[PDB]
Design a protein around this ligand. Structure first.
Ligand SMILES: CC(C)=CCC/C(C)=C(/F)COP(=O)(O)OP(=O)(O)O
Ligand SMILES: CC(C)=CCC/C(C)=C(/F)COP(=O)(O)OP(=O)(O)O
Ligand SMILES: [Mg+2]
Ligand SMILES: [Mg+2]
Ligand SMILES: [Mg+2]
Ligand SMILES: [Mg+2]
Lengths: 325, 325
């Protein structure tokens, strides 16, 4: 459970085991009883995600487990989609854009005639990814303000666009330029998770404040940094993925023609600059706009980011490190 | 210049020729001098779009030509992308998801390190689609509120997702179910155009009101209806597109195994139900929430929709009708 050497990060408290255990039992019931998420054989993979620790660690300010469950269901649904549609065996399914758009309608609803609406409605139960999105979004919409819901839909639209760029490149084994990879990884990104911190914390960042260019930069930087964290921790895992799975070290090595080690080390330095820039941008906004909802939201994003690093560091079931130090 | 027989629509006044002519000259200068939109050989296609009439007709309440130009630049950029990336010769480019995401960064900016940011910045001038988005969004961002800008980015994310579902299906000649086609056509949709009516009208629909579920349904229905208008007017044109280009009549005919004529006629009935549903949903919201910005926005969406039908009806350069009556 050691951190990537040289990776700039903040330690976090051990997550409340009582909350962890309650989330674990509730998410299991949701997955099995409400959305039929998986067949028996894939239960170990489910528990291996440690989503309870994940979310408790990422949302220390959640007033209740009900609040935590808003994020937990969405996290599990997000994984289910990426696992079932995107990582569909082979490099990338040619029909990904069609599958994702139809799944997207479970988040941003189809509106149509009396004839075609019911047929769409029925598609929402047709597979696990869509049952998962549909149910999870349902809970979110009931608890969050209309603005918080709209905000999440936009961030999900971003995520799906990110998936589709990754999938399009994989169809030809295209290795993008480093900045091009990073642009993709700005969208194919944890962003929809930290941005619901206010909903999960029981308050609202007003839409007009969310929309500020400086806030938008703060959010992008945070997502970018914490997403590269995944690149770093999952690097060894991905060397075994079908084809040549892209992550920052792999793209750096291939484009800049460096050895894997030097490319990985630079990738750590890239993460560090992103993380520091996020923190500086956050401090600047905290000062420029010291409204309580803004300050809470900024603190919650940082907590999510720190929690996300902690979850990656400790998840030895999913991840391990390269021998580069 | 006759309307599709049986198509429910509202007549509109002749657009102010003075405004039309001023938009025409300004958009030509933008296209040629600012963004180098096209080489000489494709000027006829440019003028053939009649974008001046289009926008004046669609935004009767614009206080100035500067306001009209906000929408006009974006319309022209939207076309340029769809023409240059999506209709790239052949059915659909395998790398579409990558090209669109990078173009999307001209709308929703990349945030990164000191090293990679400049390389991204340089990509914004690399082709006409990106010069067009970048410049047009630049003008929009200067004139609109941060919320109006965020709203447009979400609607552009929707549009690009729509492109990618269409492109993914085209890669295998997949004909979706009718409702599946309509779900795609809900995103691959004029929506980003009528939704900027308030910006172009010099006022703001507040974000919290935009976010209301009833408003979201009103917007989706309006976009859905006015987008099927295009299916109907461009049907004959598309019979000549590479492969089998999908539109509502073609999908209805293929899935429900009907002759082209009966499928087209049903497609008109589908349009009509969508249009009526939009109007009823709009009346319901006008009554439920009689705030001035809401009422103006609802009237502007309807004006855009009526204007969009008028532009299709009169554009005999681009469109013609089937002999089905
Ligand atoms: C939670 C969410 C919004 C999306 C899940 C996909 C995503 C954005 C990641 F960053 C997971 O990284 P990766 O796809 O590389 O998954 P890994 O196998 O390394 O854990
Ligand atoms: C203006 C905008 C946001 C996007 C342009 C693409 C689009 C959504 C259309 F509806 C054009 O229809 P089509 O793609 O069938 O173009 P046609 O060739 O029939 O005129
Ligand atoms: Mg993935
Ligand atoms: Mg990874
Ligand atoms: Mg098109
Ligand atoms: Mg058409």
């Amino acid at each position: 459970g050691r951190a990537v050497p040289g990776l700039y990060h903040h330690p976090v408290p051990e997550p409340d085991p009582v909350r962890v255990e309650e989330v674990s039992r509730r998410i299991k019931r949701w997955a099995e009883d409400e959305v039929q998420l998986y067949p028996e054989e894939w239960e170990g993979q489910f528990d291996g995600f440690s989503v309870g620790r994940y979310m408790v660690g990422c949302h220390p300010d959640a007033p209740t487990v009900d609040h935590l469950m808003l994020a937990t269901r969405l996290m599990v649904a997000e994984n289910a989609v990426d696992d079932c549609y995107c990582e569909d065996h082979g490099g990338s399914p040619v029909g990904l854009g069609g599958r994702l758009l139809l799944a997207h309608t479970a988040i941003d609803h189809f509106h149509s005639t009396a004839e075609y609406t019911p047929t769409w409605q029925a598609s929402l139960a047709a597979d696990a990814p869509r049952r998962a999105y549909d149910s999870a979004m349902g809970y979110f919409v009931r608890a969050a303000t209309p603005s918080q819901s709209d905000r999440y839909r936009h961030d999900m639209a971003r995520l799906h666009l990110g998936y589709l760029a990754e999938g399009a490149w994989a169809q030809t084994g295209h290795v993008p330029e480093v900045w091009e990879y990073l642009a993709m990884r700005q969208f194919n990104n944890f962003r929809p998770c930290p941005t619901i911190t206010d909903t999960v914390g029981g308050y609202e960042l007003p839409a007009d404040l969310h929309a500020r260019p400086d806030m938008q930069r703060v959010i992008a930087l945070a997502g970018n940094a914490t997403t590269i964290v995944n690149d770093l921790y999952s690097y060894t895992k991905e060397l075994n993925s079908p084809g040549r799975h892209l992550n920052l070290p792999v793209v750096i090595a291939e484009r800049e023609q460096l050895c894997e080690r030097d490319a990985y080390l630079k990738a750590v330095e890239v993460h560090n600059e992103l993380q520091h820039s996020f923190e500086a941008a956050a401090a600047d906004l905290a000062e420029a706009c010291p409204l309580p909802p803004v300050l809470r939201f900024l603190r919650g994003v940082a907590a999510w980011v720190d929690g996300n690093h902690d979850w990656h560091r400790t998840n030895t079931y999913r991840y391990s490190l390269p021998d580069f130090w």
